[PDB]
DNA sequence: CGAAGGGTTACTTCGCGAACACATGCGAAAAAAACATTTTTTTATAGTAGCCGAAAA
DNA sequence: TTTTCGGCTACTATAAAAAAATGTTTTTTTCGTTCGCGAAGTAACCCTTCG
């Protein structure tokens, strides 16, 4: 049960509470979709003083950041071109 | 129960069950303390197996 | 249950803080002599979940390790030589 | 209970032999079970239980009838029968009705002796506490054990069966011989124990019987006078007859006082007299009041002269109560000013 | 027993009228209602005028009483002084009360702060008790039902 | 009972639930259990995660670690014991998790106050130039600008970079911030102790004072190195008179925005207090003041060298002295008239600013001087914290609990019998509000023995203050409130995933005709209003938690 | 050269067990309040506590 | 000088609506038969340091 009130009123007609929650949803859309296009190579080759992660990051140069949609479109085109037996 | 009055019961243990451990009997000491006494059906689990 | 109900009524009803501390210290003592008893005594020990595990009559030393088995019998013995030793 | 496999709803029987005693069915034989497993207001009722314990152990009653009076008092307090008494009369009345349930030997005076209360107020509260019953079935009309247990503390004899059995026989024969209907069971016990002791070869002082039997001295003599009146008492001196035939000519003296009833010094609903015609004739007028001129309307009040003498008499005699009333009003209007 | 046995209604009445008198003494009268130039560069460039009561509050009590327990020898006034500077007054050292920082809102909420105001408020203004409701019944999901949750 | 009471998440982990409940909504399925095992144990190596969680071998743990490294939710350490095997040991970082808390109301608060470059519909590029820096971590112009084909906007983006990096907000060299604060102090103390053997016979004074003063000045120049830099160099080689070099990686969100946010909190404090023309002047004064102010996190005491000795008073002496010395900030009304508000005794602006700036004193806000040239704050932020706590406890139940808490704090820790003197009611409601307050752990109890025997009948009681434990309790309470709110919002996400995703797939060009039945239109609009309500309450709850942070 | 900051060994006081079977919240001053008694008006009616005279020697 | 049997005195009980002076049971404030071994408060004495 719940007796008290810690005053979190919603003023949804204000401009800033609309725009700030829209930017929240946009930030969630950017982060939940994972990384971005080929600008993470700088993140890979930062390598301040790091032998082990300087071995880790060139392993994940070809990580699933933005090439999953193109591979999925190529697989959909190959499925529309011919039949293939695999699990979905 | 205990004694002779109610029905009766003759316990073995705390110095007596150790004798068949000194012999090395395994299935007698298991049976006469589990199966002949009380066979119960506790259900268990793997994830939080209470 | 009753002392916790009395606390739940009296604290939002409003009573004296010394009586509150006395009744709540009685709450603290009743749990302490409800489990792991015979440390306080204001047959008059009560049995909780430590006299059932203490020894020689508890669930360790006479009800679990040495338990009263079935299919037994107890009678005095007379000698007889004419039986083999088996 | 009717849980079985081959049959349904049969009887059962736990075994007597082999020290096995399982609850088994019949005519096929299935145990059909497992092995046998064998092994605020309360403070007011506590004060009432202690007071009932006191009156119970003082009045010499057994222990079960104490709990019977306790549950009777609990049911009565659940019906909200009384409040605010001194509780001696209440506990005595509850133990009296629980005690006069049973045929034991306890009358009203044994309760009226405690706390020195008059017996009539205790009986009045006993008929005030019957505003819960609407049953009132009490077997009260048998004063036979009174004779059996009064003869232990009074009329001490070497035998105490020869006097007692003939006493209760003569008393029941006299009660069936029209001498007992609301006619003092302790008194008839004293009377047909003095008569049976007179049959025995031992006499009593008349005070010794009426002392512990809680009966008056004159009333038992009136009883024995009526025994001399009814029974011829010639054969009663030596030995009573083994075949006593008593038919007719039997009455209490209330029948005599109705037989003389002074001193010389076709049912129909419409034939019954109607009572509304007497009220219908005389007028219901609050304004008409002057039709009673029969020398009484002109003789109510006298003049002013012989009235200040009456006022003088009243102020001279009934003075202290008026002074206490006026001083009590002055005491009030003193001590209600502050808070 | 001047203020001890004084419960309860005229303690509140005397509290309300001394709150009104110090709010109209240590600040001007009607410039707390609207924001159309409040108080005119307060107390005329807030220098050396800057005064307070200094026994004038007991003179205002002397202006009007009901003659039962209301002859206070500057000690029940000090008790109510302690009762007011621990809730809503600051009271820099001697007698300068400074009633403000909650007087304006819950004084001019009645017939001074009507609907259709000036500008929308910033989210979570801490010094504000007004317009906080959440349900006709509407308590379905995680609305403001969060506080302390019976730990 | 029936799990709808929400107790399986209620009376459990208050602190170790938010830090990896955020990354359930941000990172995903396997980049959350790494934080859930790292915070729950503390110090972890590489193989220890693999032997703890049975999710994968040492292949996909690398992906989570190199996804959380530049997001600075985790910091590393490469060291050996005595022999070798130079493996990377791992603490857990907190500042990246604060960035994942604050990101949206970082980007939506900075524009109206700090960055005054341009306002003629530049919101289409602020999100692209800021959110891509938070969601990636670094900034290299030769790879980041290469997505933009135009060259005319490149000079404007470079000027935005210059003016936004003038006021901090982007750590320039971006080195050494993946190292622990305690490890820096221990390493510098160890290095500054190894340099002096075979000398005069040592003492506590000579060794301790020499090693600690050298460690303080070296750690101070280390922490002040990334604060002020000159990497924006080689002006006009062929064009572009003010250009930032693109070689050095460039991180985001220095805590000067946190300093500005508590500055906005103090502006709200001054607005609800006297004046409000004091608010309209002191807002523009303090938003110019707080660029050089001392930092909230306060290094040189984050490492456990706070002991009850000369080091403890040296911290307060430093907080009094450095705040006056290192900013300077020679601020007057002639400095305020340079950045003067449009139409905000309306005429004769400068003397009015003199009188309003000189009238804002006593209490401790804007501590002045005859001929003032600065403004301190050392006894103003705890006053803000206490005042926010007291108006929250006024929001708890009635004004009476707020009166009772403030009177206990103000009459210096007094017993119970004299409380009825400074009160309204005699006994009933004061015990009611004291019971409802003693359910919280904010006003303590004190027991004294009367006959040297502990008995709860013969004892007199008084009430301790204990403010700091109450601030910690409110801090973890607000943290649990945010964690419970975002967990319920994540449940609201995951119970309605497929109908949001079906409209997300291909209905974007058909949002007008809505391409669906009107029932799920109402369902989508209702869950959108739910998400708007949750974020609108989360911003306020986040600010109320943000007051309680020191 | 002398007063002061940890640092440990030494004396003293507080927690458990002793076979293995058998058949024998309580108490104690008062306080607001819902309530009966106690009338007097008879008055029918029996007798049961207590009181002297006509009866026998 | 002794007993017994008839005259008066009269109070209990139920029923009536009548209404006043005065006494009668539950609550809310406060409290006085070992002995052996292992572990935890107060003192006696060195290592080291500043005025
Ligand atoms: Zn059968």
Minimum distance, in Å, between the CA of residue C72 and any CA atom of chain B: 7
Residue to substitute from F261, F354, F359, interface E, most E β-carbons within 10 A: F359
- Contact, D115 CB vs strand H, < 7 Å: no
Helix, strand, coil in percent for chain B, rounding step 5: 30, 5, 65
Neighbours of chain E (3+ CB pairs under 8 A): A, F
Q: Which residues of D touch B5 (CB under 8 A)?
A: none
- Contact, D325 CB vs strand H, < 7 Å: no
Identify which of D304, E18, B2, F229 has the alpha carbon closest to the alpha carbon of residue C68: B2
- Please indicate whether, in this complex, the C-beta atoms of F423 and E83 are within 8 angstroms of each other: yes
The residues with which C66 forms a beta bridge, in sequence order, are none
From F458, which residue of chain C is nearest by alpha-carbon distance?
A: C18
Q: Rounded CA gap, F69 and D193, in Å?
A: 118
Dihedrals φ, ψ of F88, to 5°? -95, 115
Residue to substitute from C3, C6, C13, C21, interface F, most F β-carbons within 10 A: C21
Measured at the CA of F229, the angle between CA F102 and CA F181, to 5 degrees, comes to: 55
Is the CB of residue A50 less than 8 Å away from at least one CB of chain E? no
| CA F542 to centroid of ligand 1, rounded, Å | 74
| CA B41 to centroid of ligand 1, rounded, Å | 27
Based on its alpha-carbon atoms, the radius of gyration of chain A, rounded to whole angstroms, reads 22
Measured at the CA of C65, the angle between CA C63 and CA C69, to 5 degrees, comes to: 65
Residue to substitute from C13, C18, C40, interface F, most F β-carbons within 10 A: C18
- Please indicate whether, in this complex, the C-beta atoms of B36 and C68 are within 8 angstroms of each other: no
Between the alpha carbon of residue A30 and those of residues A56, A64, E43, F83, F104, the distances in Å are 24, 15, 55, 45, 12
Q: Which residues of E touch A4 (CB under 8 A)?
A: 147-148
Dihedrals φ, ψ of F493, to 5°? -65, -55
What stretch of H or E contains B11?
Answer: strand B10-12
Q: Rounded CA gap, D272 and F177, in Å?
A: 122
Minimum distance, in Å, between the CA of residue B3 and any CA atom of chain D: 13
Record the resolution, in angstroms: 4.0
Q: Rounded CA gap, D227 and D233, in Å?
A: 8
Is the CB of residue A12 less than 8 Å away from at least one CB of chain E? no
Residues 6+ away with beta carbon under 8 Å from C17: F416, F431, F434, F461
| CA D21 to centroid of ligand 1, rounded, Å | 17
Dihedrals φ, ψ of A80, to 5°? -75, -25
Residues 253-312 of D with CB under 7 A from strand H: none
Based on its alpha-carbon atoms, the radius of gyration of chain E, rounded to whole angstroms, reads 20
Under DSSP, the state recorded for F147 is G
Provide long-range contacts, Cβ within 8 A and 24+ apart, for F387-393: F387/E126, F387/F269, F388/E126, F388/F265, F388/F544, F388/F547, F388/F548, F389/F470, F389/F471, F389/F474, F389/F548, F391/E126, F391/E127, F392/A6, F392/E126, F392/F474, F392/F544, F393/F442
* Alpha-carbon D305 to chain mean position: 58
Of C61, C62, C69, Cβ closest to residue B37: C69
* Alpha-carbon C31 to chain mean position: 13
Closest residue to H11 (CA to C1') is D120
DSSP for F231-286 reads: ------SSS-SS---SSS------THHHHHHHHHHHHHHHHHSS-SHHHHHHHHHH
Instruction: Examine chains E and A and say if they touch (3+ CB pairs below 8 A).
Output: yes
| CA D23 to centroid of ligand 1, rounded, Å | 11
- How far, in Å, is the CA of D321 from the C1' of nucleotide H17? 29
- Please indicate whether, in this complex, the C-beta atoms of A20 and F535 are within 8 angstroms of each other: yes
* Strand G nucleotides within a 7 Å radius of protein CB atoms: 17-28, 34-38, 46-50
D99 is in an annotated binding site: no
Residues 1-50 of B with CB under 7 A from strand G: 2-5, 8-11, 14-15
- Please indicate whether, in this complex, the C-beta atoms of F426 and E90 are within 8 angstroms of each other: no
Nucleotide nearest to B10 (CA to C1'): G21
Q: Which residues of F touch E8 (CB under 8 A)?
A: 424-425
- How far, in Å, is the CA of D40 from the C1' of nucleotide H27? 9
Burial F467-484 (b: 16+ CB within 10 A, else e): beebbeebbbbbbbbbbb
Q: Rounded CA gap, D131 and F530, in Å?
A: 68
- How far, in Å, is the CA of D284 from the C1' of nucleotide H16? 22
- Please indicate whether, in this complex, the C-beta atoms of C69 and B14 are within 8 angstroms of each other: no
Of A16, A37, A53, Cβ closest to residue F147: A37
From F5, which residue of chain E is nearest by alpha-carbon distance?
A: E149
Q: Rounded CA gap, D51 and F68, in Å?
A: 83
Q: Which residues of E touch A9 (CB under 8 A)?
A: 131-134, 144
Q: Dihedral of the CA atoms F185, F187, F193, F197 (nearest 10)?
A: 180
Q: Which three-class secondary structure state does DSSP give residue C24?
A: helix
Tokens read off for F322:
């450095």
Are C33 and C40 contacting, i.e. CB atoms less than 8 angstroms apart?
A: yes
Which residues line ion ligand 1, judged by CB < 5 Å? D 6-7, 25, 28
Measured at the CA of F104, the angle between CA F101 and CA F106, to 5 degrees, comes to: 85
Q: Rounded CA gap, A43 and F66, in Å?
A: 9
Q: Rounded CA gap, F422 and F405, in Å?
A: 12
Query: In a 10 Å sphere around its CB, with 0-12 CB exposed, 13-18 middle and 19+ buried, how is residue F449 labelled?
Result: exposed
Q: Rounded CA gap, E3 and E11, in Å?
A: 8
Are F430 and F404 contacting, i.e. CB atoms less than 8 angstroms apart?
A: yes
Of E120, E148, E149, Cβ closest to residue A11: E120
- Please indicate whether, in this complex, the C-beta atoms of B36 and C66 are within 8 angstroms of each other: no
Are D153 and D225 contacting, i.e. CB atoms less than 8 angstroms apart?
A: no
- How far, in Å, is the CA of F257 from the C1' of nucleotide H48? 50
Identify which of F69, F71, E133, F103 has the alpha carbon closest to the alpha carbon of residue A50: F69
Dihedrals φ, ψ of F78, to 5°? -110, 110
- Please indicate whether, in this complex, the C-beta atoms of D38 and B8 are within 8 angstroms of each other: no
- 3-state SS of chain D? CCCCCCCCCCCCEECCCCCCCCEECCCCCCCCCCCCCCCCHHHHHHHHHHHHHHHHHHHCCCCHHHHHHHHHHHHHHHCCCCCCCCCHHHHHHHHHHHHHHCCCCCCHHHHHCHHHCCHHHHHHHHHHCCCCCCCCCCCCCCCCHHHHHHCCCCCCCCCCCHHHHHHHHHHHHHHCCCCCCCCCHHHHHHHHHHHHHHHCCCCCCHHHHHHHCCCCHHHHHHHHHHHHHHCCCCHHHHCCCCCCCCCCCCCCHHHHHHHHCCCCCCCCCCCCCCCHHHHHHCCCCCCCCCCCCCCCCCCCCCCCCCCHHHHHHHHHHCCHHHHHHHHHHHHHHHHCCCC
- Please indicate whether, in this complex, the C-beta atoms of E126 and F421 are within 8 angstroms of each other: no
How was this one solved? cryo-EM
Nucleotide nearest to D182 (CA to C1'): G46
Tokens read off for F532:
């708007």
- How far, in Å, is the CA of C10 from the C1' of nucleotide G25? 15
Identify which of F76, F231, F276 has the alpha carbon closest to the alpha carbon of residue F139: F231
- Contact, D47 CB vs strand H, < 7 Å: yes
| CA F53 to centroid of ligand 1, rounded, Å | 59
Tokens read off for F174:
């971006």
- In this structure, chain E runs to a length of 151
Residue to substitute from F431, F436, F458, interface C, most C β-carbons within 10 A: F431
Q: Which residues of B touch C74 (CB under 8 A)?
A: 10
- 3-state SS of D190-222? HHHHHHHHHHCCCCCCHHHHHHHCCCCHHHHHH
**Residues flagged as binding site of B for Zn(2+):** 45, 48
Please report which residue ranges of F290-364 form alpha helices under DSSP H: 310-325, 333-336, 349-358
- Please indicate whether, in this complex, the C-beta atoms of C21 and F428 are within 8 angstroms of each other: no
Q: Rounded CA gap, C13 and D296, in Å?
A: 73
């Amino acid at each position: 049960e719940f007796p008290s009130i810690p005053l979190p009123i919603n003023g949804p007609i204000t401009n800033k509470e609309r725009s700030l929650a829209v930017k929240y949803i946009n930030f969630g859309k950017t982060v939940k979709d994972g990384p971005f296009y080929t600008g993470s190579m700088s993140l890979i080759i930062d390598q301040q003083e790091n032998s082990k992660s300087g071995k880790r990051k060139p392993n994940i140069i070809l990580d699933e950041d933005d090439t999953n949609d193109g591979i999925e479109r190529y697989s959909d085109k190959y499925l529309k071109k011919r039949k293939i037996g695999i699990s979905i | 129960t205990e004694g002779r009055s109610r029905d009766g019961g003759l316990r073995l243990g705390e110095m007596e069950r150790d004798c068949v451990i000194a012999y090395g009997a395994s299935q007698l000491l298991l049976e006469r303390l589990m199966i002949s006494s009380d066979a119960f059906e506790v259900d268990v689990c793997d994830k939080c197996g209470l | 249950v009753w002392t916790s109900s009395l606390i739940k009524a009296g604290l939002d009803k409003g009573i004296s803080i010394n009586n509150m501390m006395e009744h709540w210290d009685y709450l603290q003592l009743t749990v302490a002599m409800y489990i792991n008893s015979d440390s306080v005594n204001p047959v008059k020990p009560i049995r909780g979940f430590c006299q059932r595990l203490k020894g020689k009559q508890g669930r360790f030393r006479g009800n679990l390790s040495g338990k009263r088995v079935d299919f037994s019998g107890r009678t005095v013995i007379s000698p007889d030589p004419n039986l083999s030793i088996d | 209970m009717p849980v079985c496999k081959n049959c349904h709803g049969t009887e059962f029987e736990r075994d007597l032999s082999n020290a096995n005693n399982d609850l088994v069915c019949k005519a096929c034989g299935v145990v059909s079970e497992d092995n046998p497993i064998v092994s605020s207001r309360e403070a007011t009722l506590n004060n009432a239980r202690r007071k009932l314990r006191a009156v119970s152990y003082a009045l010499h009653i057994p222990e079960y009838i104490t709990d019977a009076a306790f549950q009777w008092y609990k049911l009565a307090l659940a019906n909200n029968f009384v409040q605010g008494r001194r509780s001696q009369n209440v506990i005595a009345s509850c133990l009296y009705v629980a005690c006069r349930k049973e045929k034991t030997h306890h009358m009203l005076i044994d309760f009226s002796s405690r706390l020195q209360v008059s017996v009539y107020s205790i009986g009045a509260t006993f008929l005030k506490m019957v505003k819960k019953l609407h049953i009132t079935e009490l077997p009260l009309a048998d004063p036979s054990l009174f004779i059996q247990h009064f003869a232990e503390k009074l009329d001490l004899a070497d035998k105490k069966i020869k006097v007692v059995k003939d006493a209760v026989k003569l008393a029941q024969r006299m009660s069936k011989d029209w001498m007992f209907e609301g006619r003092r069971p302790a008194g008839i016990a004293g009377a047909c124990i003095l008569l049976a002791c007179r049959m025995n070869n031992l006499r009593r002082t008349h005070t010794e019987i009426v002392a512990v039997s809680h009966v008056a001295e004159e009333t038992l003599q009136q009883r024995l006078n009526e025994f001399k009146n009814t029974k011829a008492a010639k054969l009663s001196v030596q030995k009573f007859r083994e075949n006593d035939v008593e038919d007719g000519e039997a009455r209490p003296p209330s029948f005599v006082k109705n037989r003389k009833k002074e001193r010389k010094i076709p049912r129909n609903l419409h034939l019954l007299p109607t009572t509304d015609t007497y009220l219908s004739k005389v007028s219901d007028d609050p304004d008409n009041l002057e039709d009673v001129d029969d020398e009484e309307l002109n003789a109510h009040l006298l003049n002013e002269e012989a009235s200040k003498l009456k006022e003088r008499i009243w102020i001279g005699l009934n003075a202290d109560f008026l002074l206490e009333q006026e001083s009590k009003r002055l005491k009030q209007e003193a001590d209600i000013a502050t808070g | 027993f001047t203020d001890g046995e004084l419960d309860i209604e005229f303690i509140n009445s005397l509290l309300t009228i001394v709150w009104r008198f110090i709010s109209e003494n240590t600040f001007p009268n009607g410039f707390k209602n609207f924001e159309n130039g409040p108080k005119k560069n307060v107390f005329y460039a807030p220098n050396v005028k800057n005064y307070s009561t200094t026994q004038e509050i007991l003179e205002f009590i002397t202006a009007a009483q009901v003659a039962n327990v209301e002859l206070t020898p500057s000690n029940i006034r000090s008790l109510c002084e302690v009762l007011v500077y621990d809730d809503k007054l600051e009271k820099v050292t001697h007698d300068c009360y400074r009633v403000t920082l909650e007087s304006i809102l819950q004084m001019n909420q009645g017939e001074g702060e009507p609907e259709a105001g000036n500008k929308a408020l910033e989210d979570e203004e801490e010094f504000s008790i007004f317009n906080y409701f959440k349900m006709f019944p509407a308590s379905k999901h995680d609305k403001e039902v969060v506080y302390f949750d019976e730990w | 009972v029936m799990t709808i009471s929400s107790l399986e998440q209620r009376t459990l982990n208050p602190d170790l639930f938010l830090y990896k409940e955020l990354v359930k909504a941000h990172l995903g399925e396997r980049a959350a259990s790494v934080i859930g095992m790292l915070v729950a144990l503390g110090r972890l190596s590489v193989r220890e995660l693999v032997e703890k969680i049975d999710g994968m071998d040492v292949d996909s743990v690398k992906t989570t670690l190199v996804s959380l490294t530049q997001l600075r939710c985790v910091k590393y350490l490469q060291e050996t014991a005595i022999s070798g095997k130079k493996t990377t040991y791992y603490y857990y970082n907190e500042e990246g998790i604060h960035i994942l808390l604050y990101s949206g109301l970082i980007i939506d608060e900075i524009i109206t106050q700090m960055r005054v470059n341009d306002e003629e519909e530049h919101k289409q590029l602020v999100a692209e130039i800021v959110q891509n820096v938070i969601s990636l971590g670094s900034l290299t112009v030769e790879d980041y600008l290469s997505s933009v084909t135009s060259d005319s906007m490149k000079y404007t983006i470079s000027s935005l970079f210059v003016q936004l990096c003038e006021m901090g907000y982007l750590i320039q060299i971006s080195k050494l911030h993946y190292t622990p604060i305690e490890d820096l102090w221990q390493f510098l103390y160890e290095k500054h102790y190894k340099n002096i053997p075979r000398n005069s016979p040592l003492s506590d004074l000579k060794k301790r004072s020499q090693a600690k003063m050298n460690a303080k000045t070296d750690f101070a120049k280390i922490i002040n190195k990334p604060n002020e830099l000159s990497q924006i160099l080689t002006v006009d080689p062929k064009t572009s008179l003010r250009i930032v070099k693109p070689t050095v990686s460039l991180t985001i969100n220095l805590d000067r925005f946190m300093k500005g946010r508590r500055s906005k909190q103090l502006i709200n404090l001054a607005k609800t207090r006297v004046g409000s023309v004091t608010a309209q002047v002191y807002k523009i004064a303090l938003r110019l003041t707080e660029q050089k102010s001392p930092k909230i996190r306060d290094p040189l005491t984050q490492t456990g060298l706070l002991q009850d000795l000369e080091e403890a008073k040296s911290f307060q002496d430093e907080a009094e002295l450095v705040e006056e010395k290192t900013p300077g900030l020679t601020f007057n009304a002639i400095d305020l008239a340079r950045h003067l508000p449009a139409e905000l005794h309306s005429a004769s602006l400068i003397n009015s600013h003199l009188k309003i700036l000189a009238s804002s004193n006593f209490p401790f806000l804007n501590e002045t001087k005859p001929g003032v040239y600065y403004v301190p704050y050392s006894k103003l932020m705890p006053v803000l914290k206490s005042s926010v706590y007291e108006y929250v406890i006024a929001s708890t139940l009635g004004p009476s609990a707020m009166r009772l808490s403030r009177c206990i704090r103000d009459n210096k820790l007094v017993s119970e019998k004299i409380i009825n003197s400074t009160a309204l009611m005699k006994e009933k409601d004061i015990r009611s509000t004291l019971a409802s307050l003693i359910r919280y752990n904010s006003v303590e109890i004190q027991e004294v023995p009367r006959t040297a025997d502990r008995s709860a009948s013969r004892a007199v009681f008084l009430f301790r203050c204990k403010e700091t434990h109450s601030y910690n309790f409110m801090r973890q309470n607000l943290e649990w409130n945010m964690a419970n709110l975002l967990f319920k919002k994540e449940k609201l996400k995951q119970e309605n995933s497929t109908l949001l995703k079906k409209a997300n797939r291909d209905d974007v060009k058909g949002r007008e005709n809505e391409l669906l039945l009107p029932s799920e239109l109402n369902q989508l609009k209702m869950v959108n209003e739910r998400e708007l309500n949750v974020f609108a309450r989360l911003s306020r709850l986040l600010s109320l938690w943000e007051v309680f942070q020191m």
